[PDB]
Design goal:
The protein is an alpha/beta fold. 22% of the residues lie in helices and 21% in strands. The strands form 6 sheets. An 8-stranded parallel beta barrel has the order 1-4-5-6-7-8-9-10. A 6-stranded antiparallel beta sheet has the order 11-12-13-19-15-16, covered by helices on one side. The chain is globular. It binds a molecule of 7 linked components (NAG-NAG-BMA-MAN-MAN-MAN-MAN), a molecule of 6 linked components (NAG-NAG-BMA-MAN-MAN-MAN), 2-acetamido-2-deoxy-beta-D-glucopyranose (2 copies), beta-L-fucopyranose and sodium ion. The site of a molecule of 6 linked components (NAG-NAG-BMA-MAN-MAN-MAN) has 6 residues, from helix 10. It is an enzyme of class 3 (hydrolase).
Length: 581
Amino acid sequence: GPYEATWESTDKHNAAPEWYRDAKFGVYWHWGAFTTAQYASEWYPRNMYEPDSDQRKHHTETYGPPEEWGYENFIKGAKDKKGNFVQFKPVLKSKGGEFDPEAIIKIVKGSGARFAGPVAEHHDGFSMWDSKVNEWNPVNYGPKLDLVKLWADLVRENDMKLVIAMHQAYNYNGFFQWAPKTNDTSLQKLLGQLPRDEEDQLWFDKHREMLDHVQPDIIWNDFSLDSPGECGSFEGPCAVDEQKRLEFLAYYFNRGEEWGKEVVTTYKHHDHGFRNTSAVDDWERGGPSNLVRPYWQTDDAISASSWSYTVGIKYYSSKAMVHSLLDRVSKNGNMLLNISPMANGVLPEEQIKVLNDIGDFLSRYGEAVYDTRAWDIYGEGPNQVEGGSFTAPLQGNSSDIRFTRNKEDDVLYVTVLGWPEDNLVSVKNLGSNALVDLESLKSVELLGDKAGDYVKVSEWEQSKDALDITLPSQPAESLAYVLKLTFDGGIPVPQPERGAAVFSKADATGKGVALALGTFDTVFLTEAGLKPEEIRSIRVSDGTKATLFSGFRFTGESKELSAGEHEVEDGSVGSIVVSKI
Ligand SMILES: *[C@@H]1O[C@H](CO)[C@@H](O[C@@H]2O[C@H](CO)[C@@H](O[C@@H]3O[C@H](CO[C@H]4O[C@H](CO)[C@@H](O)[C@H](O)[C@@H]4O)[C@@H](O)[C@H](O[C@H]4O[C@H](CO)[C@@H](O)[C@H](O)[C@@H]4O[C@H]4O[C@H](CO)[C@@H](O)[C@H](O)[C@@H]4O[C@H]4O[C@H](CO)[C@@H](O)[C@H](O)[C@@H]4O)[C@@H]3O)[C@H](O)[C@H]2NC(C)=O)[C@H](O)[C@H]1NC(C)=O
Ligand SMILES: *[C@@H]1O[C@H](CO)[C@@H](O[C@@H]2O[C@H](CO)[C@@H](O[C@@H]3O[C@H](CO)[C@@H](O)[C@H](O[C@H]4O[C@H](CO)[C@@H](O)[C@H](O)[C@@H]4O[C@H]4O[C@H](CO)[C@@H](O)[C@H](O)[C@@H]4O[C@H]4O[C@H](CO)[C@@H](O)[C@H](O)[C@@H]4O)[C@@H]3O)[C@H](O)[C@H]2NC(C)=O)[C@H](O)[C@H]1NC(C)=O
Ligand SMILES: *[C@@H]1O[C@H](CO)[C@@H](O)[C@H](O)[C@H]1NC(C)=O
Ligand SMILES: *[C@@H]1O[C@H](CO)[C@@H](O)[C@H](O)[C@H]1NC(C)=O
Ligand SMILES: C[C@@H]1O[C@H](O)[C@@H](O)[C@H](O)[C@@H]1O
Ligand code: NA
């Protein structure tokens, strides 16, 4: 194939193809041998060995000391302290058991997911496909089923793109740091104790074997690709050999070409192991606080506990999941939602209800979500995401709106996160203070009870503070409500209260991009719809300054501009920093 194992060659791969930007919402599942204990989290295989931990205490009381009853017993099977046989061994419904993967995939399809699939290998060394390179798999042991192939075939039967999640780097970069050393070479493979050159090779061989086996549309990767300092107390680079990373990228991108498919690979945002030229950044739970470019994704979970089922697990609400989805999509990302089947393969009814409720929302209001793109401002209102460390998912109300727009850039969707009891939606960024001319606003419509229904909004006025929209009669109840604003000849470019707007003509007209406070490089401005070489004017808000740089990313000659309108020489700007005075 045309890709070579170098950064410069692999950079040419299109990171986020149009189908992936259109998709918005996917579902995956942390289900595996790490679920067997149904205790604490999916990190149980690591923590069962940790000195003085709650997980070790539980393990020791339930099974035996971890030095005698090691993690490998969950895969190969053993008796617990009360003489019960314990093993990861889901039994198909068609064989009289409780594991019904077809039913689960129908539920996932019904949720509105446009991509779906399993965690194929987490950090615990167990590959869930029929693997020649790793004997630690569910065909050799346990259920005698190729779980990954079963899931993949069902996902394709149900007309969703296939995502496969792979977390196999941390396996040998510290996950099993507390497991006893072993001279059993097979057990060393499970526990990440092989020589590092062999482990680096195995990281690649696992990816290669899996991706040739199921032809994934997306390969999702966890951390420890090159994330020094993120592997706790283990002495090591918290990384995969660079050559092996590059060989993976070239192999997968070449296979995509061979298959006639536009493929995607994701990696954790903070990790340095891949580049954002060719791989999609996957933000920590909650996502970014701001609108980020280029296109990115984040993962979330129904569970309010761990990623994998545990006894006593608590869940978040349908509302939180839907509001979270709208938030991520408005900020130029996708949301990949995790679900948590029990060790036996049963999906709990509380999770089914959440998925059903997301699906009801998307079936009805999908026009505002699928196939849309972010505006230049993600939303308005008091309820926001902080970023950094996740506490609880976003839940908004009638005070909050999130924006999305169509590909033609003449329809703005204004999604309000509750029904306003005052029957008013006020859009600050379309008010007169926003320097927005609404002469071109042709229609304002409320999306109705079923997709394709529109109820006209008759009354609206533009104050200084906002476009003030009076709602018609409330439609059937929903978790959020959608207004559709159609403009002749393109959505107006708002002026942020503190921020700037850049334009393709010299007089603050033409194509434009609104900018908040922050830093905006050539990639940002280009993706937002205005290559910086084409900027010919800028309007800087009161209380704000803008610093223009000639370089791609805040290097080269710079010029500071205060509040007002300013002409800009063609080809003079590469990047911009917008700051509060
Ligand atoms: C995709 O991946 C790529 C690759 O990993 C990511 O690219 C990296 O992006 C980084 C963030 O933009 C970028 O880092 C910036 O580099 C600038 C240039 O550095 C080079 O030149 C300078 C000057 O010679 C050298 O000193 C330097 O060592 C480099 O060789 C730096 O200038 C940037 O530093 C400034 O910003 C950071 C915040 O990112 C501050 O912590 C820092 O103190 C600096 O702060 C000033 O400037 C920023 C403007 O960026 C202002 O916001 C801030 O208020 C400070 O303002 C003072 O100074 C400015 C003049 O600089 C003045 O106008 C102002 O009034 C103030 O006096 C920063 O370090 C990496 O270089 C880049 N890497 C590569 C390989 O490209 C990319 O981000 C990824 N994409 C996404 C979406 O994540
Ligand atoms: C005090 O403050 C100062 C100033 O902030 C701090 O200095 C900074 O310290 C950084 C850490 O040392 C230093 O970054 C390093 O810079 C070198 C030179 O550019 C760079 O090579 C380093 O990158 C390697 O190492 C990191 C950390 O593990 C990896 O994430 C990264 O992938 C690189 O790994 C490659 O090189 C390693 C050997 O160094 C190999 O072991 C590794 O396998 C890997 O090799 C592969 O990749 C190579 C290409 O990357 C390839 O050639 C090779 O063949 C293999 O394929 C790292 O970024 C900053 O430069 C430095 N800043 C300044 C201004 O000095 C200082 O740390 C502070 N002190 C304290 C106590 O905190
Ligand atoms: C494992 O093999 C090494 C090398 O022969 C040996 O030193 C060590 O004692 C062995 N481990 C055990 C538990 O016997
Ligand atoms: C919506 O949430 C905001 C922020 O917590 C709050 O100030 C406002 O009163 C809420 N509105 C309603 C109707 O509860
Ligand atoms: C999605 C989460 O990513 C983290 O890096 C992992 O360590 C967790 O177990 C989980 O898979
Ligand atoms: Na690219």
